[PDB]
């Protein structure tokens, strides 16, 4: 038993070692490893699979094998090599689809990730990617999911050309149609990792050799210049197609109005600056058409609308579009947020914890160059204090800190204030102008530190 397992492991090690020393001459050993893998023992199956993974990654070329002794035998060698690689992959989907056995499946996922990270450029990558994404498309996080998404994320970062990323994006999009755009939120975060979008003495030479060396050097320089231009154009075209597939998936997700609207707006905000100007004007229409977790969704729409308008140079590109409809939506949405409860527990625009966007929308609102503090901020801040009647003090202190560090010198925000227009539903007090409410009641509250927070506000 144990002796037999040890003997098989030694045989695999010897065969693997011989392959590393002389890979071309020992192709039959790979078939022997497959026979060894056929052994009933689960542990021997794991070791044989790992050795096959180690053997394949060591002998696989760094280039893509062009399909069909110096050239003929190499072709037969490469054609022969592709056959085990296909057979090894064929076993991979068999064991993956077949899902003690859990450990073997985790190992099967592991070698799949290793092939993804290293053998992405190689042939059969379409099958390799399809098998891996099929595991992620499931409703529950299957084991090794963290490994696969990390491998996919790493490829998206390293892939400067974007051809491999385009293949994965297409496969991911196909799963979304199969899943009706209902997948884990981590899956949509893969599109955010696309680097293409985020980019925004001497040995002696004979008299004949010197002329050959000069002639090759001229070709290489000409090759490099043309390749650079072709690379720039191909990357640009790949970026366009990736945006086409990604945005069509996001818009489909918005149409279904599922629970993945959070990740869709995340991607839309991140990739909005990559899209055409004409689409920027029509982008806010879809955001503002969803007004009939409803409060949470409206928060995403107004925040993303702010982010899209926050793009640099919008002053030069006067697309207008009157984001005031989103402004009044945020102006009205604070009251239901104060009405419903919220819990941070303990240990989507850009983050989580809904209160975080609100201050984030407020701080980008403040960061707007002179767009506020024209007697409109005070009207907004009044209901901000009204909405501050509940929620943790650190949140309450945060919003009061925003007006504390505010450059505007208005001081009547927490007291009687100018006309509260724009949907009203509050004390207008028109034409008052008196430097003379909420902090008085805020002093009496469950946490003792709110009292001193109110005191520090009135003293400051």
């Amino acid at each position: 038993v144990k002796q037999q397992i040890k003997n098989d492991k030694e045989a695999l090690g010897i065969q693997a070692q011989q392959l590393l020393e002389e890979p071309v001459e020992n192709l039959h050993l790979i078939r022997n490893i497959f026979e060894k893998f056929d052994s009933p023992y689960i542990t021997i199956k794991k070791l044989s699979l790992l050795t096959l993974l180690a053997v394949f990654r060591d002998i696989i070329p760094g280039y893509k094998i062009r399909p069909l002794k110096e050239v003929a035998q190499r072709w037969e060698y490469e054609q022969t090599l592709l056959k085990h690689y296909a057979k090894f992959l064929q076993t991979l989907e068999t064991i993956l689809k077949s899902f003690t056995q859990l450990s073997l499946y985790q190992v099967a996922v592991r070698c799949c990730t290793k092939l993804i990270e290293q053998a992405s450029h190689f042939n059969l990558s379409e099958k390799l990617f399809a098998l891996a994404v099929r595991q992620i498309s499931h409703k529950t996080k299957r084991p090794g999911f963290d490994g696969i998404i990390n491998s996919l994320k790493n490829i998206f970062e390293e892939d400067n050309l974007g051809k491999t990323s385009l293949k994965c994006v297409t496969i991911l999009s196909r799963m979304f149609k199969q899943r009706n755009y209902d997948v884990l939120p981590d899956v949509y975060d893969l599109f955010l990792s696309v680097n293409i979008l985020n980019d925004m003495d001497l040995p002696y030479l004979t008299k004949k050799a010197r002329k050959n060396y000069k002639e090759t050097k001229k070709i290489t320089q000409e090759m490099k210049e043309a390749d650079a231009v072709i690379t720039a154009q191909d990357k640009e075209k790949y970026q366009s197609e990736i945006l086409k597939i990604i945005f069509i998936t996001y818009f489909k997700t918005l149409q279904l109005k599922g629970k993945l609207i959070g990740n869709a707006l995340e991607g839309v905000a991140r990739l909005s600056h990559l899209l055409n100007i004409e689409f920027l004007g029509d982008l806010l229409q879809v955001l503002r058409e969803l007004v009939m977790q409803a409060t949470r969704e409206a928060l995403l729409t107004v925040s993303t609308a702010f982010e899209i308008a926050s793009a640099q140079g919008v002053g030069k590109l006067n697309l207008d579009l009157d984001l005031g409809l989103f402004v009044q939506r945020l102006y009205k949405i604070i009251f239901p947020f104060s009405l419903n409860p919220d819990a941070d527990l303990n240990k989507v625009v850009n983050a989580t914890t809904e209160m975080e966007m609100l201050l984030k929308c407020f701080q980008v609102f403040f960061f707007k160059s002179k767009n506020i503090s024209s007697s409109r901020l005070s009207s907004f801040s009044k209901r901000l204090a009204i909405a501050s009647m509940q929620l943790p003090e650190h949140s309450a202190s945060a919003d009061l800190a925003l007006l504390k560090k505010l450059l505007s010198r208005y001081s009547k925000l927490s007291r009687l204030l100018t006309s509260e227009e724009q949907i009203g539903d509050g004390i207008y007090n028109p034409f008052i102008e008196d430097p003379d409410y909420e902090p008085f009641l805020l002093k009496n509250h469950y946490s003792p530190a709110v009292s001193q927070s109110a005191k520090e506000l009135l003293k400051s």
């Binding site: 399809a130 099929r134 498309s137 196909r174 799963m175 199969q178």
Partner: peptide, 15 residues
């Protein structure tokens, strides 16, 4: 229930 079994078409590219 996740099979990627997915024809003839045409792409109008000429004037």
């Amino acid at each position: 229930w996740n099979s990627d079994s997915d024809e003839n078409n045409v792409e109008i590219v000429t004037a």
